RNA sequence: GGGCCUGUUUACCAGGUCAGGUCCGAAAGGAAGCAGCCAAGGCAGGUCC
């Protein structure tokens, strides 16, 4: 399960805008989505970093349920 | 090293185009733009100078 599968799954519109701003590698391994990258992603999808951060936490929450389902 | 070619590589760090999204506007419409791709660069090879 990754930022892609999670993408498979209104405010949802922006759940995209964000992910749509990433790289196949980021989607393939979020555990590297640091500040520099974040900052990029936020402005990428006209969001605030804390928006990205949240979306990271959200998927995080599910990735969890996945790594324990 | 240069030209041409091919393989490969390259998140943002004044290239181009920008799906998605965002911004300003009552509207009409403007603007900045991530990923992609294009291009450019890196690493090699083939080839010609």
List Cα–Cα distances, A34 to A3, A45, A56, in angstroms. 15, 16, 11
Q: Report the distance separating Cα A9 and Cα A13, nearest Å.
A: 11
Domain formed by A1-68, architecture: Orthogonal Bundle (1.10)
Q: Which nucleotide is nearest to A23 (CA to C1')?
A: B35
With 0-12 / 13-18 / 19 or more C-beta atoms within 10 angstroms meaning exposed / middle / buried, residue A49 is middle
Q: From residues 2-61 of A, list those within 7 angstroms of strand B by Cβ.
A: 13-14, 16-18, 20-25, 34, 36-37, 39-41, 43-47
CA–C1' A46–B24 (A) = 14
Q: How was it solved?
A: X-ray
CA distance A14 to A54: 12
Interatomic distance A64 CA / B14 C1' (Å):
41
> Are A1 and A30 a contacting pair, CB within 8 Å?
no
């Amino acid at each position: 399960f990754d930022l892609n599968d999670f993408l498979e799954q209104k405010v949802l519109v922006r759940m995209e805008a964000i992910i749509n701003s990433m790289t196949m590698k980021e989607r393939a391994k979020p555990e590297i989505i640091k500040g520099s990258r974040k900052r990029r992603i936020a402005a990428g999808s006209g969001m605030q970093v804390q928006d990205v951060n949240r979306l990271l936490k959200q998927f995080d929450d599910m990735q969890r349920m996945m790594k324990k389902m």
